[PDB]
What does this fold into?
Amino acid sequence: LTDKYTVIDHTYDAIVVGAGGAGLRAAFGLVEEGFKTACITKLFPTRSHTVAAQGGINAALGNMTEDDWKWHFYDTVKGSDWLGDQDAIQYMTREAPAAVLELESYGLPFSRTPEGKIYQRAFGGQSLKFGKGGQARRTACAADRTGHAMLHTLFGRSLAYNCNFFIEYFVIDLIMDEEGACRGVICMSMADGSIHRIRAHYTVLAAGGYGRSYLSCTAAHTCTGDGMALATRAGLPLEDPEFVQFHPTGIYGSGCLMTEGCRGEGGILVNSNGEAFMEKYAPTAKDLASRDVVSRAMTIEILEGRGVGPKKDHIFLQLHHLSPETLHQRLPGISETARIFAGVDVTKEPAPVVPTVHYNMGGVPTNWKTEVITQDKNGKDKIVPGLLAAGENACASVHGANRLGANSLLDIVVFGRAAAKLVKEKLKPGTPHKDLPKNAGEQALARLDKYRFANGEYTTHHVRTAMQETMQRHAAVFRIEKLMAEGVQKLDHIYEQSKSLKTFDRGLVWNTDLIETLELENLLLCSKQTLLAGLLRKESRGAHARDDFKERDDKNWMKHSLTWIKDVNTGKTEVTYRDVINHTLDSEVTPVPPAKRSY
Amino acid sequence: MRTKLYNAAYFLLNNNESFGHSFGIRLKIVGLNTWIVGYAVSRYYFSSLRVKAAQDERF
Amino acid sequence: LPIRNIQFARYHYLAAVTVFTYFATRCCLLDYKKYYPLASVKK
Amino acid sequence: AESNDATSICLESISGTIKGLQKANYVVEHNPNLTSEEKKHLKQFLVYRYNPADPHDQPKYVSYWCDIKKFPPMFLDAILYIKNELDPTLSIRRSCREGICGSCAVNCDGLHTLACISGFNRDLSKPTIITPLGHMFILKDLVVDMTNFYAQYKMIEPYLKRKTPKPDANKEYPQSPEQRALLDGLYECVLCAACSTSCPSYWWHPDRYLGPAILQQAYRWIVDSRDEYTQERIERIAEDVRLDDCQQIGMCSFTCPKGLNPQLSLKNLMDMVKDFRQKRIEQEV
Amino acid sequence: EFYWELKTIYLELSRGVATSNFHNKREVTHSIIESDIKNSIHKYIQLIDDLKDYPEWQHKVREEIGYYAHMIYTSVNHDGNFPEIFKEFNKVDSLYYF
Amino acid sequence: MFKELIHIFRTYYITFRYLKKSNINFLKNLSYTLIAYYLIINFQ
Ligand SMILES: CCCCCCCCCCCCCCCCCC(=O)OC[C@H](COP(=O)([O-])OCC(O)COP(=O)([O-])OC[C@@H](COC(=O)CCCCCCCCCCCCCCCCC)OC(=O)CCCCCCCCCCCCCCCCC)OC(=O)CCCCCCCCCCCCCCCCC
Ligand SMILES: CCCCCCCCCCCCCCCCCC(=O)OC[C@H](COP(=O)([O-])OCC(O)COP(=O)([O-])OC[C@@H](COC(=O)CCCCCCCCCCCCCCCCC)OC(=O)CCCCCCCCCCCCCCCCC)OC(=O)CCCCCCCCCCCCCCCCC
Ligand SMILES: CCCCCCCCCCCCCCCCCC(=O)OC[C@H](COP(=O)([O-])OCC(O)COP(=O)([O-])OC[C@@H](COC(=O)CCCCCCCCCCCCCCCCC)OC(=O)CCCCCCCCCCCCCCCCC)OC(=O)CCCCCCCCCCCCCCCCC
Ligand SMILES: CCCCCCCCCCCCCCCCCC(=O)OC[C@H](COP(=O)([O-])OCC[N+](C)(C)C)OC(=O)CCCCCCCCCCCCCCCCC
Ligand SMILES: *Cc1cc2c(cc1C)nc1c(=O)[nH]c(=O)nc-1n2C[C@H](O)[C@H](O)[C@H](O)COP(=O)(O)OP(=O)(O)OC[C@H]1O[C@@H](n2cnc3c(N)ncnc32)[C@H](O)[C@@H]1O
Ligand SMILES: COC1=C(OC)C(=O)C(C/C=C(\C)CC/C=C(\C)CC/C=C(\C)CC/C=C(\C)CC/C=C(\C)CC/C=C(\C)CC/C=C(\C)CCC=C(C)C)=C(C)C1=O
Ligand SMILES: CCCCCCCCCCCCCCCCCC(=O)OC[C@H](COP(=O)(O)OCCN)OC(=O)CCCCCCCCCCCCCCCCC
Ligand SMILES: CCCCCCCCCCCCCCCCCC(=O)OC[C@H](COP(=O)(O)OCCN)OC(=O)CCCCCCCCCCCCCCCCC
Ligand code: SF4
Ligand code: F3S
Ligand code: FES
Ligand SMILES: [Ca+2]
Ligand SMILES: [Ca+2]
It folds into this structure.
């Protein structure tokens, strides 16, 4: 048996699987609500990917220019390309000003306008007066390191309360009973290999995306989509996995990011000819177009032979036009990063950039109150008891087919607070727990032991590299049916290989090899679902662009694509569809009809 | 329980100018005080010594 | 803030330190028995 | 059944110290089957390895000969190349890859620094030594126990406390660009602990004395104009040797890979503490 | 005085792991100090329980005394009798000191 | 001065950490008394 693993049982009113912005927000919000809450993270909170976020927090404060949150809602809907749920977008947009002001109240250092108000700068895809008011400066940014400051402020507030952090615990699986409810979580202590079965009523499942599924990706090494894989292994569906947003600017050959806000300060994109070409692809907003269209324009310019650098493989991001004072005051961190990872002095030289895998619009589906949902066998969606996805891990549909840009932090904060509010709404602090199922964690320990003592033929790194190369080659900016089918075959072969992995460490204390193997399994699941969902959708919408079907079809494909991986061992993927929401939470804002422009 | 161990930093850090500059002042003061105290102790010790005795003398 | 007779306090502390050091070390009252072999003689 | 073991332990300690001094910097070749001709084209990394979980393991350098023309020029890239290609049991913390998370702080060849944004001596003759942070307990390989660092960080109450209600609740705490730039170069700390592991006062008194980083954070929360617990924070950091133990060595500002100046922040904190002590007497009268 | 009891235990451990300690270096913790740690932590938990009516006093006792309990926790590996010695500490206090 | 000597001994010697501030103060008082006695007696 697997009883040889030490097992310890806890009991909490609520759990938060993750310590990013969403995780910390939800945890200390729950603690405010009066619930005995716990937070589980494999990294010290201040080292989550939220720290690396550079652009600002998008919100409709009327400081730099007259703004109204309805305009922000319209911009979000258009940027989503009419594939995001209207209700969730309305809620997030309406709550954005309060969320940002509360963040400032916590002590988050925001760049200050001369009058003392929070500073804001233009971003890609913003506008006023429902698109006809010109560029909109609504992104409230704390210099060029907004993510770092926001995460540190949230962590400080968390410390202000008692959140019972589980620092550097890796969550293996979700304890679910036969009724489909999430009883709790099963995690491991990387320090000494102890296994903890944390029982709880609600489990806020916010554990980031799977950016590391590709070869070149700005995502941290720890962004392995554990949140999206726990649900998949638990039988829950995954929503909109084919849409992957490529940030237009990313340092070539390194994967590091060039803050989009730089192009908002006055940066330019240049091909080998030495001209700004984005006008031909975005005559209205020029550089500050939606990330998807900018990335497609850059890819086309690359494929047109006008590659800026040696072997014509990237594009020049010019920033020396701006004054050095502006660069040092608004873009210090990115200037240093360019100096390091490129050896290019931003003040007087152009940086090399290429579109890079940035964000995962996919995730565990929810409704808008941050409750996981799943299609009942009839075909109607039902709420999974005791499970509240949040953050990037949750496909609340607030981003639809293309994230607007600088809306991810806003989504994080707003929906973490919303999840805490919902837990307060439904659960009561003084509710006794029922015993965990008979087979609490047999399968979790089984998988852990299987990967721990694996003596297969292929090394974890080899399989991970094969998967990353396959995704990079076949799930790039442009998709085509034959190439995607080849990629699906390759991914099936790689998955077959993964059943015979080899691991070289049989220890438990900080056995990073085992952690990376588990993350490899998670990324394999996510990659299979992503590629199949991309293959099925026969249209060109949002970030999902196909050479065979260049026109989006609102008549047939205006529906989220849910993916199922049942019987993980079999590794066969099915796909169904869930209709989009076209009804706002209220009559305050009329839902935006499907237009035909997308810039 | 196997007690944990660590590698002392000063054994594995490249020598730096800050260490030298600060520990120089600290050692200057240490030397001054140690010299004063040792001189006092030396005077006490030497004055504590007995007087020379005759050759092959008992008591 | 004002300290009455601060200068007197400074000089008293200095004098105390000087006297204590003088008596403890006997810096001024050396021993010259070690120099006798290296000295000339009269008479 | 057990007996007194003072003598055996003493003799073993003395003998082991002598032998270790004789056999300091113990090194084991990862792949002994290397022709000396081949080593001309490969650079040598001496990586510290230690697995306290295994009762039979003891600390040791391991020698890896790698072709530096196969991965980018950074300490983290070399470490990960060794892990993935040669020996995947190596342990190290890494999240951000661009010097932001601060998890990869290690002793990169004699200097504490983030391994992700630090290059290494390209010359193929001089070997490169990678070891964990010095005075931190070693959990496995290049992974140290930074728990005490976080515990100390918690004691400074790093959250904005205000004694005056906001006038309208629909605005933001006013702060002019000067009162914001007062924080510039002071909130960028990533809590890597590279500086504090290089502070001798922190070597000698890890618990009673807060590190340079934590004290810099306290200074950040003090100088911030929006918070109103200035005197309270000053008094809290003025206890025993939480701050008085700093000797202005200045190594903290020299090691900081982010370019911050914790030494200056600590100097300002000392000045403010002195003024607080004096005017607790001068004012209340 | 209870705080100084815990600090005495920690000081013994620190002298054990000191770099200058070339003469009294011990690989494995002996039973006596293990028993002392266990009983000290038991008394500390009982004290925390007895201060349930005084949140400020309870918080101060945690922040002050439990600091050295946490340092003792960090001084040793998680093997041997470690799960049993720190059983009470692992419930709540260990999570606080992370 | 005395304060500095005590500080150095505390920061460098691990064993000296055992002493409380109260014991340090008692040593301070005894040392001051002995210094006063020394100053007075040497002149007698
Ligand atoms: C590692 C192993 C090491 C082993 C070492 C072994 C050493 C054995 C020593 C044996 C005893 C020697 C005694 C010498 C006495 C000298 C005075 C004298 O003649 O007095 C006559 C003496 C009467 O004394 P007194 O006149 O009453 O008072 C004497 C006082 O000293 C007052 O007289 P004064 O007023 O004339 O004083 C002069 C004045 C002069 O002071 C000054 O002005 C100072 C000037 C200094 C100049 C230095 C210049 C150096 C240049 C440096 C350049 C560096 C450049 C770098 C560049 C770098 C690149 C840029 O003050 C001093 O001399 C200062 C002394 C206080 C010392 C303070 C420090 C004490 C602690 C540290 C000790 C050393 C530790 C080393 C550790 C090493 C570890 C590795 O009577 C005799 O005739 C006795 C003669 C001596 C023999 C005594 C025998 C006793 C035997 C006892 C039994 C046990 C013996 C055990 C032996 C063990 C051997 C292994
Ligand atoms: C069982 C009980 C518990 C036992 C515990 C164990 C230990 C024993 C404890 C026993 C309790 C007493 C301990 C002694 C006191 C300790 C004090 C202390 O630690 O204070 C630290 C504390 C350190 O503070 P700080 O912040 O560091 O500042 C110190 C600075 O020095 C700042 O100093 P400052 O600036 O404030 O100055 C202080 C002031 C203090 O002085 C005074 O005001 C006092 C004056 C003397 C009074 C003596 C009264 C004695 C009465 C004795 C009666 C008989 C008793 C018999 C008992 C028998 C048994 C029943 O100095 C002066 O007044 C300076 C006078 C200078 C005169 C210069 C003359 C100039 C002549 C020329 C004139 C101009 C001519 C012009 C010509 C021009 C020609 C052209 O000291 C003070 O602040 C107070 C001042 C120092 C007082 C020292 C007193 C020492 C007394 C020792 C007595 C030993 C008796 C043994 C008897 C044995 C019998 C068997
Ligand atoms: C002639 C007139 C009469 C002279 C004698 C007068 C004696 C008066 C009474 C003295 C009472 C001393 C004991 C009470 C004080 C507190 C002790 C304490 O902390 O207790 C626990 C503490 C033990 O703590 P632990 O937990 O066992 O240790 C682990 C901790 O991590 C350790 O943590 P920690 O930081 O607390 O430990 C540091 C510890 C030091 O303890 C240690 O951890 C190691 C001690 C041994 C070190 C040996 C050297 C190591 C290698 C260094 C390199 C040497 C190179 C030499 C060659 C150079 C060639 C060029 O520091 C101390 O012991 C503090 C006081 C030291 C000065 C006072 C004692 C002076 C004794 C001098 C005579 C010794 C016997 C003769 C030796 C020569 C025979 C030919 O101390 C003791 O129990 C041992 C006491 C010392 C025993 C003697 C060791 C040799 C010391 C030589 C010093 C020489 C200085 C230079 C001037 C000498 C002028 C005479
Ligand atoms: C009459 C007797 C006289 C005997 C004379 C003996 C002289 C002793 C001189 C000792 C010098 C200082 C080092 C020992 C004491 C340290 C005390 C202390 O506080 O340190 C604690 C610290 C160690 O502790 P730590 O670093 O763990 O700090 C404490 C941290 N906590 C609290 C977290 C545990 O410092 C040291 O001990 C440093 C030791 C350095 C050792 C250097 C050895 C150099 C050897 C050179 C040999 C040269 C030979 C040349 C031959 C040539 C031939 C041709
Ligand atoms: C990569 C990136 C993203 C980014 C950005 C720049 C970069 C380089 N700049 C942005 C910007 O300017 N504006 C913006 O709106 N977004 C920007 N982004 C994207 C955005 O920051 C992220 O999408 C979002 O912040 C991520 O939030 P989330 O909290 O969901 O993700 P996370 O911070 O990575 O949190 C994950 C946490 O969960 C823990 N974890 C992970 N796996 C596990 C397992 N298995 N068990 C337990 N815990 C787990 C992680 O340790 C972390 O704490
Ligand atoms: C100031 O703050 C600081 C600290 O405190 C918090 C630190 O801890 C630190 C770090 C601290 C440490 C590493 C401490 C641990 C290490 C230690 C103590 C090692 C150092 C040890 C010592 C200094 C003691 C040993 C040395 C001695 C006894 C010195 C002996 C000297 C001798 C014998 C002199 C030799 C020279 C001569 C005899 C001269 C010969 C030539 C001539 C005479 C010339 C000829 C003359 C004629 C006339 C012809 C720093 C850097 C710091 O800055
Ligand atoms: C830096 C930190 C430390 C600082 C420490 C400071 C200490 C301050 C001490 C203050 C008090 C000073 C007292 C001085 C007493 C000196 C006594 C002495 O040994 O004097 C020398 C004496 C012979 O002197 P005398 O008879 O006068 O003959 C010469 C006359 N022209 O010699 C003799 O008669 C020889 C016999 C007596 C001496 C015996 C010594 C025995 C030592 C045993 C050591 C045991 C431990 C060994 C450890 C190592 C083991 C491997
Ligand atoms: C591992 C090894 C560990 C070893 C540990 C050892 C620890 C030992 C600690 C104790 C020894 C410390 C020695 C310090 C050096 C001696 C200094 C001294 O003589 O002064 C002592 C003290 C003042 O010095 P201090 O308190 O240190 O500094 C105060 C700064 N404001 O002076 C006093 O307070 C004494 C009281 C008198 C002060 C002077 C008073 C004024 C002087 C004039 C008096 C006039 C009296 C009447 C008239 C007489 C003349 C006519
Ligand atoms: S003080 Fe410097 S070295 Fe330490 S965490 Fe902050 S930036 Fe890094
Ligand atoms: S390196 Fe060390 S002691 Fe003080 S000012 Fe700088 S911290
Ligand atoms: S690896 Fe990201 S900061 Fe060190
Ligand atoms: Ca998402
Ligand atoms: Ca203030």
